Amino acid sequence: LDRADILYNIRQTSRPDVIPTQRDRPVAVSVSLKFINILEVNEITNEVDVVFWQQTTWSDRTLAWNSSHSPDQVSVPISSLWVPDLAAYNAISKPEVLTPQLARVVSDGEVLYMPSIRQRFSCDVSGVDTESGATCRIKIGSWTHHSREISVDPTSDDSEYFSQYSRFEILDVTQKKNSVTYSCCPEAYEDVEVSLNFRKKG
Amino acid sequence: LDRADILYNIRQTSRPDVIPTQRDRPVAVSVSLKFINILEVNEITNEVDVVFWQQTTWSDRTLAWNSSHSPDQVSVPISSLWVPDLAAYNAISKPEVLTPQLARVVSDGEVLYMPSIRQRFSCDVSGVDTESGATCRIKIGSWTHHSREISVDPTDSEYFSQYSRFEILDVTQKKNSVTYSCCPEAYEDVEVSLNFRKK
Amino acid sequence: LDRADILYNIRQTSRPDVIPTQRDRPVAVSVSLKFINILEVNEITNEVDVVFWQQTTWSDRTLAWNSSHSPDQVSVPISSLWVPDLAAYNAISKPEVLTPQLARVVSDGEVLYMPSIRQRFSCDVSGVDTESGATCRIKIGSWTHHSREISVDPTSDDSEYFSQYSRFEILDVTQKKNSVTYSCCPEAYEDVEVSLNFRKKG
Amino acid sequence: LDRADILYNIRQTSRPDVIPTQRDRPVAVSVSLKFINILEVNEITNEVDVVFWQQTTWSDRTLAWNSSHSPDQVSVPISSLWVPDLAAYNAISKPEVLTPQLARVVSDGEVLYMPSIRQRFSCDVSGVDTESGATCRIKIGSWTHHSREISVDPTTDDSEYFSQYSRFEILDVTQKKNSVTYSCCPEAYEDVEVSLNFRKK
Amino acid sequence: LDRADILYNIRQTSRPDVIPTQRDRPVAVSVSLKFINILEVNEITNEVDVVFWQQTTWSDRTLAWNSSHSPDQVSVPISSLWVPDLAAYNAISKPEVLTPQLARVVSDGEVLYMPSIRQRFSCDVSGVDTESGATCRIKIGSWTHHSREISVDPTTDSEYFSQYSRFEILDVTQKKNSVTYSCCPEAYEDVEVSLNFRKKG
Ligand SMILES: OC1(c2ccc(Cl)cc2)CCNCC1
Ligand SMILES: [Cl-]
Ligand SMILES: [Cl-]
Ligand SMILES: [Cl-]
Ligand SMILES: [Cl-]
Ligand SMILES: [Cl-]
């Protein structure tokens, strides 16, 4: 197969509306935030404007092809793929996607989608101008798929991609798995809670 | 049936333009606002910027499937479904939808659509910096469907951000049904009274 | 007929690009503005930011159906209908439509379209902080259809739907029929001139 | 023919991607800006926010019909027509189109497209608060079509449509045709340079 | 062939989803920024708002046609072409494209795409109000295609820069880099554009 054939096959048989569950197990989605910038912070309103790369991976076996005498990977527009319906629970703006909306598909059906996103959050900005800094928690999970359909799991240097030119610096990033069960319903919705410990540079 | 078959069937036979009335009874739409944040308040202009989850439920029997050896529920893009034409009467900005535009469809044809919306409203901000607080009333109803086509009923502060400059004292919901001088028909709305104050 | 059949028939046959002229007479469009709010006024720049319901009615006989044992009216997306190409001649922002873009179609082919619009205008803001108030004139008519193709005519209490919470109050609204000729072309374009007499409550 | 037939024919045979050149001669595009308002001016940054009607005309013979016992003109969505790829070279915002995106098509294939546009420009705001005023020059031409494919010409009262309520007033509007060879490409690109001489009241 | 036939053929066969690699060599993409304006600078936040023409060229042999008794070039909507998935690594706003989204396709399959973009960047604004000025570095490369799939090269400063900017350009250098990230084995090529500029005195 060449790239043309693989991309034709994916475009022609793409069920972007269909979660690729295998044998009634959840789709395992990995999410890791790489912080790139902290642009605007307001300690009065507890609001932050952040840029991050959202490293997102999952398997869709319907995409897989025999890689013998074929490309190992192709770039696919996300409009031709099922993508997890991830939302930031404490976002106060729509995600501004700064990058081309393409994912990488490996011949085994692994998908890697890593958009650069600028987004505003409601989180704890208290202590931002102190030595110990602020801890801003960002929660990202499936909007409509509970734990039997989508599982979310966290997956380098926290500041490896962070802009040296930000007014802020990163002290620590932790990414941990949470679940919310709401009063209305019995099902749990999984999220990654990303704790961004940062401060204003002196 | 698997998810692929159910979602194919819905996509292929979706009449998103067709209100799913049964036996000439109105479609019963439930609306409950879960307040998440109060972001900007202006007591001079009487304007508020609010984030809420708009819990919206109704039945569309045309979506229903036999759930024996099948999923009980699927996630469906709202572009493939009829959705009530709800509007906030006192909104002064278009709703900014912060979440994926998917609904949950249950095998009995129940639809649950719960977008996170940021929107600006014209309401009473007077008293926001006092102990008793402000009461901001938000009215939501069908823009074009009268009471014989759509009924709206209330089904709320539990998921409010601890980091807001504001706090919720109380949320009350009433149903209103208004017949205007021009027309014979009644228009239903849910009136949500948000009593909040600066911390 | 049921709603499903009527909406199918309209979607299949509507011709949204085709002005429904009868025997080469103009399409009679009625326009009435119901003011809902006055949000921002600037007496220096002579600019106002207003919210209004634009009550718009006309007949399209191609939409009509036999109402015996059928609904008298349906809700139709405006993308499935011909709609008059109305513009505010003194608008300085695009109309922000706040409401679902649906019209009501009666079985005789009468259409009622009433969007809630927020829009900014260039008009006379002088006297806004006085007892007599400002008179801000808004002109609305067809962008491309002259008087032989579209006629515009004005169609309750002026303040009936006006927000009690506005910094402003309405003293009077008058709506009258005008015509504009541009220097380039011989034809007249009909408009409704809406005079909004309002003042600061102070 | 009635309007329904003409609009069906245009919609069914519309090649909006295809420049309607005749025998490898350029498409003659006429462009005239009618200024409606000057909303924000900044003499520090040399930026202006303007509203104008962009009167745009050209011929597309593929649209033409026999007008005997037929309408002489129809309103057509620009999504069903080829439109010149005009750009303002010194625009610093996207054109905000305020009006329905319809053009007039005459039975001979003449197209008239006149959107109301709000747009921000980088131009000379110096002297805006003086008697002689500022001269803000706006250059509009085809982004991708050189002079053998598109020619641009100014059309053959400057304040006739200008808002009486603007903080500003128009002293003069002049339009001149330029034909410029840029470093990237060997071909010449035509533009209309519109000089807006205006001042604060 | 006429333009209508060429544009039909391209629309029917272009494969916009398919990188036009030849014999498993990378697609050679050339990128050069022509700075048009510097609109807003903030030395406190280290943010700049810039307008530039992004001159972008590559070959797609699947677009080629016999140019004998045919146009040498056509204007094609980029939605009908494969375009490199270029991103500015230090952009903090989405690119605001100010120009019609058309590329030029030559009969040999060479593509020229040159949008005017307004975009905000995180870069070194320190020294902007001094004689030596600030040096703001902008890195542009393929978001998803590593060096075996896409190579990025500069073509070899103030020619199109607005005389009305509050700022002036002292120097522009454009040089080729390769970045390997810790997670993954492949290198991604980028053009690093160093914009040395200052406030006019
Ligand atoms: O459906 C969700 C929900 C949240 C809160 C309440 Cl009170 C009810 C339902 C849970 C899944 N994510 C979207 C919202
Ligand atoms: Cl690829
Ligand atoms: Cl599902
Ligand atoms: Cl209906
Ligand atoms: Cl017409
Ligand atoms: Cl061409």
Author numbering:
A (entry chain D), C (entry chain A): 20 to 174, 178 to 224
B (entry chain E): 20 to 174, 180 to 223
D (entry chain B): 20 to 175, 179 to 223
E (entry chain C): 20 to 175, 180 to 224
What does the paper behind this entry write?
Importantly, AChBPs can bind nAChR-specific ligands and induce similar conformational changes as in the membrane bound receptors.
In total, five structures of Ls-AChBP in complex with a ligand were successfully solved. The unit cell was comprised of two or four pentamers of Ls-AChBP in the presence of FL1613, FL1856, FL1888, FL3044, VUF24234 and VUF6105. However, the number of binding sites in which additional electron density was observed varied. The electron density in the binding site region was generally poor, indicating that compounds may have had several binding modes in the site. A computational alignment and superimposition of AChBP taken from the protein–ligand complexes and the apo structure showed that there were no large global conformational changes in any of the structures upon ligand binding. However, there were small changes in the loop C region of the crystal structures of Ls-AChBP. When comparing the protomers in complex with a ligand we observed that loop C moves differently upon binding of different compounds. Notably, binding of FL1888, VUF24234 and VUF6105 results in a movement of the loop closer to the compound, while binding of FL1856, FL3044, FL1613 and FL1909 does not have the same effect. The plot indicates that binding of nicotine, FL1613, FL1909, FL1856 and FL3044 do not result in any significant conformational changes in this region, while binding of FL1888, VUF24234 and VUF6105 do.
